[PDB]
Each structure stands twice: as structure tokens, then as C-alpha cells.
Amino acid sequence: SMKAIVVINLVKINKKIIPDKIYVYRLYSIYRLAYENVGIVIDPENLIIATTKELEYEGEFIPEGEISFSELRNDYQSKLVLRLLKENGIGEYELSKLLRKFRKPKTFGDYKVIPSVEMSVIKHDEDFYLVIHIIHQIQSMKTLWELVNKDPKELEEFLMTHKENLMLKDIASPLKTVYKPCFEEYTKKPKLDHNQEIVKYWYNYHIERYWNTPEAKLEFYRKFGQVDLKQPAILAKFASKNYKIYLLPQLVVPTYNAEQLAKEILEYTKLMPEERKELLENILAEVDSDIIDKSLSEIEVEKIAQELENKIRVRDDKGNSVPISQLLWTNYSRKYPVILPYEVPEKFRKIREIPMFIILDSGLLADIQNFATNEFRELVKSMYYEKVITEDLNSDKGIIEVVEQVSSFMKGKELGLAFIAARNKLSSEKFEEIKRRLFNLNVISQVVNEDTLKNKRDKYDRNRLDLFVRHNLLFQVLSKLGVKYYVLDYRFNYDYIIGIDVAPMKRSEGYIGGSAVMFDSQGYIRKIVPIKIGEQRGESVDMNEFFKEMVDKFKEFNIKLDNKKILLLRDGRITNNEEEGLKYISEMFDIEVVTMDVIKNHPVRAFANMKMYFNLGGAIYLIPHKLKQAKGTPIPIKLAKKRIIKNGKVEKQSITRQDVLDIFILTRLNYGSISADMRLPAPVHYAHKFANAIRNEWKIKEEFLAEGFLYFV
């Protein structure tokens, strides 16, 4: 509707930081060499570096003469300035120490949350801005070995249940180097060796190398103790950036990037907009340099009309058409609300009976149990426009008894629904495992935890779940069944909107390189497909093959893309190779492809909690919605380098207000997922989710996927 001024985490840099003369050169590493000489790598392949100092290098090299700051592509200008700021004592090391002067490390259990700042340079107009973004690392104060209780048959479990985000820091080394545990590719089995000789070499390697003094050794042993030969050696690779190193759980500690991911920790890593603003001002005021401004830059944003808030509507059996944003004699009943869909998959026309399962976590008080079972019973009735299983969902014996009991009632059946009520104790893996195991049996499931059950009750009926919550549960289940329970008063100027994502995983006669999720111009999800490919030749996926298989797979599912216009989006920056693949697919099928980067991981932050969007550095930042309940700062979705590809040809475009509106609507298609955090247009979001489901051994019912069933969500 209207404009506004908000503060962002940028601080203008002084032009005077720009170097007098710049030296180019053609050819520790190439990046080190540059950094060592106060310069940067202009060209990775042809090893060309730009230096602000006479290049010192005792090897070969060819001087390519001086160049001026105005001749570098923007990116390089920004990288070069970032590097120069460091020379002035303004780098991630320095300012992170300042941050910790105001936001100190806090420990929770055996874990320590460490605040620090992530810094980059964005060139906006003709100026350069230093982006300072507060982030947190979560390091264990206990060693991996100590964590698993020196039990090997417990260590492997750990590497497995935490495979996705687990990293290991070698606290036994002066450089505190971080590593990534290696796994039996396409498996969750970690690469291990109980070979006592390996464990001895490397354990002895640390000492002879970094602690070769009587006292350095004494501390070492006081600190870590004698080698525990019963421990297996963990094969892993550098986290920076092929090599492969050995780590001893006795000398490493798990480490994680908080943003990349308990409870008391989150209330500490989540910061309100004013807390972030304050902390950067504390840092800035402590910065004794005039090479950068003393205060945060403000920018003019475009607020988003509350009208676009109501383009998604639901309806009942009568003629009530209210948008997604939520006395009468009947309000006394526990009956759920009535949602009359606009479209129901044709698969439901034949299906006979549909088994219903109330799966109750035996560890929930009786009342909570009855509450849940009574709530599910009402949820199912509305579902229609029964077996009760009770087990300790928090033990490998129960989940198995549950699955075992379900498969018993599911043989001969095409579809089943499971309503699970579990404590909050359950790990994500356990929830994921119950849902995946149960889907192997054609059972779609909806989990509801104790939290919602206790704190989301209705003020007029404490024996009934919150009416807001009730509608969202209904939406989630319905969406897992491909039901078009809503209508969108909007039309996309595209034939189809497609979200893809690459995540190579070998599977039973498969080899799947990624996934694609298709939405039609009405904003409905119509097809979800896996992208099967050949065994990777070179160290890089053949996108041409990838995207062709995309076109072919959709045909298999009843959708020809040839001679069609589509908005293809992916989870992240669009790589050159993916572009080629898109040019490839463009010509071969005469497909008009409109694409752009859709970044969710950038450091730019606007210290205001409201729906808005603005232009910064040639990109567009958008906040799809405001945080309504939970504490924290909104994370904008970054859009950039848009382009249209017709007849194998790429033509750079500019992101228009209409473009931003399309992303906005696509982002609000979160399908009643309580706790809105969808920071990606539904197409890319679900694309990402499916790639995961495949990598997690989820059954691929092509029958459901062809109708848009979000069963893996």
C-alpha cells in the first residue's frame, strides 16, 4: 500500500578505501596468495589475481599489468573492498570479538552458543556497503567420544541421527579446524575403522606436531587423556572451501551452525529486530575507524497491501467464502469446521474404505490421550466432506510395534490415514521415521504434539482444540491428499510454475538427481516428480540430461511443456550449468523459460517486522509475512539475476513489481502449516522437501505424486 523507511544491517563504506593502483597477475593456494598480497582472484581457472600490493610469489607467474578499480565487475569490486576493510581491522574476526562484548556466549547443558558476525560487501548504486549479520554457532563443550559414553555402538547412531548438520571441530588442534563426517555414500552409515593403528598414528600425530613440550603434553593428557583404542577413527573432509582426513571422537566436538538448524537455545539465538539493531550499534561505536560510517543505513521499502492477504479463500457447504484469516447456537459441538473443496483428486472416486488410525504415544497422560483421540475423531468426520494403537513412540520397540500393527490392518488397502499424538521429547528422526515407515504401508499421517494439545485449546471449550489450529490441521491433511481445498483469486502469467532442486541419491534401479514440483496458473499443485539420471560421468551433474528428464517425466505424468511458458525456480542461485540445461531444454522443446535466483541464505536483514520488499544492490528482498507469535527477526527471500530463455537463448531481465507479487502469492501457499516459516515460494519449498524425502528412503507412490499428494511433507 504505502512506502516506509526501515533500518537494515548495512553501513556505508568511505570511498577513500578504494586503492590507488591495482595489479593483475596470471598463473597455501591461489586464494591465499591473493589474500596474502591484499588482493583477490579475478579468474579461478586462468589463475588471474588482482592485487593492491606488488605481488610477492617465489614461484612462476606473469604480470598482466595494472588495472583500475572501475574496471572490475561489481562483484570483484565488492570482494576487493571487503578484503581491504580487513586490512583496516574490520573483518569477521575483529567485530565478532566486539559482538561478544555485548552478546556473550551462553552454555546450555553440554552445549555452548557462540555469537559472531558474518560480513560481506554489497554495491548498491555507486556506493559500497558493509553488511554485518549476527549469527550463532553451537559447539559442544564435551567431546564426541565423551558424548556417546565411549560406546562405539552408540557413536555410529550419533553420526547417523545428526548426519545433515553435524560438523566436527578438532579442539585438539591449535587451528580449531572444522570438518564434515564422511558417510557410506547414499547411506546414513558413517565411514569408520576400529583399526587401533589408525587411532594411534593420528592421536600421536597431534602431540609430536603441536604439543611437543613436557607441559604442552601434560595439559594434552590432562585434557584428553591417553588414547582410547576402543574408539573408531572417523573419516571426514575439510569443512572449508578431494582429500579426506581421520578424526578421533576423543579429540573432536560436534559443531553446528544455528541458523542452519533445542529450546532454551533458540530463545537465545533468536533476536528481536531492536536487539540486532542495538548490538550492531554497540559494535560500530566500538569500532575506532572512520573508514566506515558510525551508524546503520536506512532504506526505503514498499509495504505490501493487506489486500493481497485475502486472495486465498476456503468455503463451506453453504455459500460462505471467507479468505484464509480466522453467537451461533451450533458452536457448542466439537464437530470440526466444514471445508467444501474446489477439487478432489479423481483417485478418491473408486477407493472403498479408508482405514483410520489413532496412534497415541503411551507416554502422554491419559487425559491428553483422550483429548487427542476425541480431537482426531472429529477431524476425520470433516475430512469426509478405526483402530487405536498405543505405544511408546519414543523407543525403537514401540515405533516397530506401531508399524507392525498398522501394516496388519493395511494389507489389501490402497490408502490409510494415521493421526499421531506424541510428546515433544521425540527427536525429528523419530517423527520422520514413524511417518516414513507408515507411508511404506500407504498410510498418510498427521502428527500433533503435546504442546499444541495443551496450549492451543479453545477459550469457550477447554476440551476442544483452538479453532485456528483446527482449520490448519484440516488444511495439512487435505493437502497431503492432493485436495484443492482452496481457491486463489489470482492468475499467474505462466503455463506452469516449476520448482526444482538437485540432490543426487542412488535408489533401487534409480539414481535420482533431484526433483521438480509443478503448480498451474491457478496456483494449484498438480505434479510432483523424481528426476532419474545416469551415473554421473564428471564431477558435476549433467543438467541438460536433468532438465530433459524433467520434460520427459512430466509427459509420463500427463503434462507436455513444449510450446509453453514456465517460471522455473530452484532452491538457491541458478548455476551456469543449470542455465545451459535450461537453454538446452528451451530449444529442444520450444519452451519459454523465465527464471531467477531465489536465495533464502543471505545475510541482509531489515530491522522491522512487517511485510515489505525493497531493491538493494540490484536484487530484491522480500518479507512474505510478519512474525506473529514467535520471537526473532524476519528473513527476507532474495530474488536476483532474472532472465528469459527462448530458443536456447538467454536474455537478462529485471525483476518487476509483478515478479515480486508472483513470488509473494507463491510463498503464501504454505498449506495450513501451523507456524508459518515458509521462506520459499511453495514450488521451490516442496521441491526441496521432496528431494529430501527421496534422500531419506521415502516410498515414491507415483500414483499419489501424479495428483499432487504432499504425503512426504
What cell numbers appear for 4 in the block? 516506509
Report the alpha-carbon distance of residue 625 to residue 627 in Å, rounded.
7
Residue 474 or 694 with smaller CB distance to Mn ion: 694
Please state the closest distance from residue 561 (CB atom) to Mn ion, in A: 22
Residue 302 or 501 with smaller CB distance to Mn ion: 501
What is the residue type of 447? V
Residue 170 or 571 with smaller CB distance to Mn ion: 571
Please state the closest distance from residue 269 (CB atom) to Mn ion, in A: 22
Using alpha carbons, list the distances in angstroms from residue 687 to 497, 501, 503, 527, 708.
Answer: 12, 6, 11, 11, 12
Please state the closest distance from residue 688 (CB atom) to Mn ion, in A: 4
Backbone phi and psi for residue 362, each to the nearest 5 degrees, phi listed first: -55, -15
Q: What percentage of the chain's residues is helix, strand, coil (to nearest 5)?
A: 30, 30, 40
Using alpha carbons, list the distances in angstroms from residue 466 to 77, 320, 409, 670.
Answer: 54, 21, 32, 19
Give me the sign of the Cα torsion angle 496, 501, 504, 505: negative
Residue 213 or 601 with smaller CB distance to Mn ion: 601
Q: CB atoms < 10 A from the CB of 643, how many? A: 18
Q: CB atoms < 10 A from the CB of 236, how many? A: 24
Burial of 658 (0-12, 13-18, 19+ CB in 10 A): exposed
**Residue 571 bears catalytic tag:** yes
461 is in an annotated binding site: no
Residue 423 or 679 with smaller CB distance to Mn ion: 679
Per annotation, catalytic residue among 501, 542, 545, 662: 501
Q: What is the dihedral of CA 10, 14, 19, 20, to 10 degrees?
A: 160
Q: CB atoms < 10 A from the CB of 111, how many? A: 19
Residue 478 or 503 with smaller CB distance to Mn ion: 503
Within 8 A by CB and 6+ apart from 83, the residues are 34, 35, 38, 39, 40
Please state the closest distance from residue 600 (CB atom) to Mn ion, in A: 9
Residue 484 or 688 with smaller CB distance to Mn ion: 688
Per annotation, catalytic residue among 571, 578, 597, 707: 571
Residue 501 or 707 with smaller CB distance to Mn ion: 501
Within 8 A by CB and 6+ apart from 440, the residues are 699
466 is in an annotated binding site: no
Residue 114 or 687 with smaller CB distance to Mn ion: 687
Helix/strand/coil for 677: coil
Inter-residue long-range contacts of 394-400, CB under 8 Å, 24+ positions, other chains counted: 394/361, 394/363, 394/422, 394/423, 394/425, 394/426, 394/430, 398/362, 399/430, 399/433, 399/434, 399/437
Neighbouring C-alpha atoms within 13 Å toward the C-beta of 466: 14
For 33-89, the DSSP string reads HHHHTTEEEEETTTTEEEESS----SS--EEEEEE-GGGS-HHHHHHHHHHHHHHTT
Residue 249 or 681 with smaller CB distance to Mn ion: 681
What cell numbers appear for 130 in the block? 558493509
Please state the closest distance from residue 693 (CB atom) to Mn ion, in A: 12
Report the alpha-carbon distance of residue 171 to residue 223 in Å, rounded.
10
Q: CB atoms < 10 A from the CB of 244, how many? A: 10
Report the alpha-carbon distance of residue 698 to residue 706 in Å, rounded.
16
For 81-99, the DSSP string reads HHHHHHHTT-SHHHHHHHH
**Residue 685 bears catalytic tag:** no
What cell numbers appear for 662 in the block? 508472483
Please state the closest distance from residue 501 (CB atom) to Mn ion, in A: 4
Please state the closest distance from residue 8 (CB atom) to Mn ion, in A: 26
Residues in the site for Mn ion, rule: CB under 5 A?
Answer: 501, 571, 688
124 is in an annotated binding site: no
Please state the closest distance from residue 594 (CB atom) to Mn ion, in A: 21
What cell numbers appear for 267 in the block? 530463545
**Residue 688 bears catalytic tag:** yes
Neighbouring C-alpha atoms within 13 Å toward the C-beta of 144: 32
Please state the closest distance from residue 571 (CB atom) to Mn ion, in A: 4
Per annotation, catalytic residue among 542, 549, 688, 707: 688
Please state the closest distance from residue 506 (CB atom) to Mn ion, in A: 18
Report the alpha-carbon distance of residue 79 to residue 641 in Å, rounded.
18
Please measure the distance between the N-terminal and C-terminal CA atoms of the chain and give it in whole angstroms.
34
**Residue 495 bears catalytic tag:** no
Annotated binding site: 501, 571, 688, 713
Annotated binding site for Mn(2+): 501, 571, 688, 713
So which residues are the catalytic ones? 501, 539, 571, 688
